[PDB]
Design an enzyme around this catalytic site. Structure first.
Site, PDB file in Angstrom:
ATOM      1  N   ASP A  36       0.787  -1.225   0.000  1.00 24.29           N
ATOM      2  CA  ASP A  36       0.000   0.000   0.000  1.00 24.29           C
ATOM      3  C   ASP A  36       0.822   1.279   0.000  1.00 24.29           C
ATOM      4  OD1 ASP A  36      -2.120   1.809   0.135  1.00 24.29           O
ATOM      5  OD2 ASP A  36      -2.686   1.282   2.202  1.00 24.29           O
ATOM      6  N   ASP A 232      -1.132   5.488  -5.705  1.00 21.27           N
ATOM      7  CA  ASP A 232      -1.636   4.624  -4.636  1.00 21.27           C
ATOM      8  C   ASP A 232      -1.988   3.203  -5.059  1.00 21.27           C
ATOM      9  OD1 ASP A 232      -2.747   3.672  -2.247  1.00 21.27           O
ATOM     10  OD2 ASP A 232      -4.543   4.928  -2.306  1.00 21.27           O
TER      11      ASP A 232
HETATM   12  C1  0KK Z   1      -7.388   4.271  -0.179  1.00 17.82           C
HETATM   13  N1  0KK Z   1      -6.782   3.372   0.810  1.00 17.82           N
HETATM   14  C2  0KK Z   1      -5.452   2.853   0.833  1.00 17.82           C
HETATM   15  N2  0KK Z   1      -4.565   3.151  -0.114  1.00 17.82           N
HETATM   16  N3  0KK Z   1      -5.220   2.046   1.892  1.00 17.82           N
HETATM   17  C3  0KK Z   1      -6.461   2.001   2.708  1.00 17.82           C
HETATM   18  C4  0KK Z   1      -6.090   2.566   4.092  1.00 17.82           C
HETATM   19  C5  0KK Z   1      -5.285   1.843   4.967  1.00 17.82           C
HETATM   20  C6  0KK Z   1      -4.958   2.349   6.220  1.00 17.82           C
HETATM   21  C7  0KK Z   1      -5.432   3.585   6.616  1.00 17.82           C
HETATM   22  C8  0KK Z   1      -6.219   4.320   5.756  1.00 17.82           C
HETATM   23  C9  0KK Z   1      -6.544   3.816   4.501  1.00 17.82           C
HETATM   24  C10 0KK Z   1      -7.081   0.597   2.832  1.00 17.82           C
HETATM   25  C11 0KK Z   1      -6.481  -0.498   2.216  1.00 17.82           C
HETATM   26  C12 0KK Z   1      -7.056  -1.766   2.294  1.00 17.82           C
HETATM   27  C13 0KK Z   1      -8.231  -1.955   2.995  1.00 17.82           C
HETATM   28  C14 0KK Z   1      -8.834  -0.881   3.619  1.00 17.82           C
HETATM   29  C15 0KK Z   1      -8.266   0.389   3.536  1.00 17.82           C
HETATM   30  C16 0KK Z   1      -7.451   2.905   1.918  1.00 17.82           C
HETATM   31  O1  0KK Z   1      -8.601   3.171   2.212  1.00 17.82           O
END
Ligand code: 0KK
Length: 390
Positions: A36, A232
């Site tokens: 991520d 992202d």
């Molecule tokens: C858009 N995005 C991302 N790139 N990682 C997430 C995330 C993770 C941790 C904190 C905030 C957002 C994500 C990734 C997988 C599942 C859920 C959320 C998300 O919502």
């Protein structure tokens, strides 16, 4: 290709995420971890969950250290909560090093884990500025660089199959590569073009022009980066600011006007299907995003095909039709160059030189008539004005 040990170390797909195998603790506990670039915490399932067949068991790790601090991470569509600690972490198909890293042990979550994704945690690769609870929780990559001789750079080749992968196929298929500490020249064709990292928080970039089949969208470039533009791997779609999305969808509709698609398709909710092998790729336009170059007044462009922005999905009737969802959607939080965009390119996160490189991916899906492209240079003026300021 000089990083053979790391080539083909990813699995997954755009909709559910791309993951790498990691180990945590002593003796090592193997977990699959979502790559991520849109977050900065290393967080793993640490308690039973209906969608997890394994999880981190801190009581079984002799090297586990409790930080005696909780972490609460709400996001748009859900949240995760957990307990902070540190442990020894390795990447089996990675650099041959073991590092002591912060780990958020997830104890409670809502719409975080995805059924059948095969991952049990997340590897937030962005900067400390956006780490939770605050910037004092050193991200994994920062720890890795500080503790070893691994160069401060990583690169991602996300490989979309171009067709649906069932449960067995997605587990058996190579989803791409995460090269830790280097650039593997076998993963791309043509040249790498670099855009500056505007600020080190998210991997923020500046878009200076947008074209649909060579036609300029003709918006004030500040609109393209309102309120930021980021790269992202943790987002599926290409997401665009409301006004940009409305202008892009109008142009994509006009270019593909020989076929009428339902409103639900353009809203990215409903699939469209064609008889096996008849997807009319040629009716859909290519999309070019011009990015600020490293040289003053210079830009370059990355061009994607409908093979990138139309995401393959299985038909409700598991038929022999070829079906897709429109993987471009609106955002109220700026442009997001998600996994469907990254699938067209080999993307170099050159943290050492505060720049992101793009080159045509050796695994991008295309047809015999068109390919994705990375081209330049172009003379572009006042590119600094394209950046948004609160
Ligand atoms: C858009 N995005 C991302 N790139 N990682 C997430 C995330 C993770 C941790 C904190 C905030 C957002 C994500 C990734 C997988 C599942 C859920 C959320 C998300 O919502």
């Amino acid at each position: 290709g000089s990083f053979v040990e790391m080539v083909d170390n990813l699995r997954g797909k755009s909709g559910q995420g791309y993951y790498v195998e990691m180990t945590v603790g002593s003796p090592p506990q193997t977990l699959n971890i979502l790559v991520d670039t849109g977050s900065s915490n290393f967080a793993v399932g640490a308690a039973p969950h209906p969608f997890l067949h394994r999880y981190y068991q801190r009581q079984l790790s002799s090297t586990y250290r409790d930080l005696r601090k909780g972490v609460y991470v709400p996001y748009t569509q859900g949240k995760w909560e957990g307990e902070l600690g540190t442990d020894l972490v390795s990447i089996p198909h990675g650099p041959n090093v073991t590092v002591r890293a912060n780990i958020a042990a997830i104890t409670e979550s809502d719409k975080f884990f995805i059924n059948g994704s095969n991952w049990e945690g997340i590897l937030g690769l962005a900067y400390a500025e956006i780490a939770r609870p605050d910037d004092s929780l050193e991200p994994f990559f920062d720890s890795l660089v500080k503790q070893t001789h691994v160069p401060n750079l990583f690169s991602l080749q996300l490989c979309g199959a171009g067709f649906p992968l069932n449960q067995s196929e997605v587990l058996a298929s190579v989803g791409g590569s995460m090269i830790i500490g280097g650039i593997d020249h076998s993963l791309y064709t043509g040249s790498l073009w670099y855009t500056p990292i505007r600020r080190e928080w998210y991997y923020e970039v500046i878009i200076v022009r947008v074209e649909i089949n060579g036609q300029d969208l003709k918006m004030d470039c500040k609109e393209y980066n309102y309120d930021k533009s980021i790269v992202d791997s943790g987002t599926t779609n290409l997401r665009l600011p409301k006004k940009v999305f409305e202008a892009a969808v109008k142009s994509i509709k006009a270019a593909s006007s020989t076929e009428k698609f339902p409103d639900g398709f353009w809203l990215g909710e409903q699939l469209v299907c064609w008889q096996a092998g008849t997807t009319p790729w040629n009716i859909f336009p290519v999309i070019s995003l011009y990015l600020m170059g490293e040289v003053t007044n210079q830009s370059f462009r990355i061009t994607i095909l409908p093979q990138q922005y139309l995401r393959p999905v299985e038909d409700v009737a598991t038929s022999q039709d070829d079906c897709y969802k429109f993987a471009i959607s609106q955002s109220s939080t700026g442009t997001v160059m998600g996994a469907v965009i990254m699938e067209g390119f080999y993307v170099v996160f050159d943290r050492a030189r505060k720049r992101i490189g793009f080159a045509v991916s050796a695994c991008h899906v295309h047809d015999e008539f068109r390919t994705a492209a990375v081209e330049g240079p172009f003379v572009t003026l006042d590119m600094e004005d394209c950046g948004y300021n609160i």
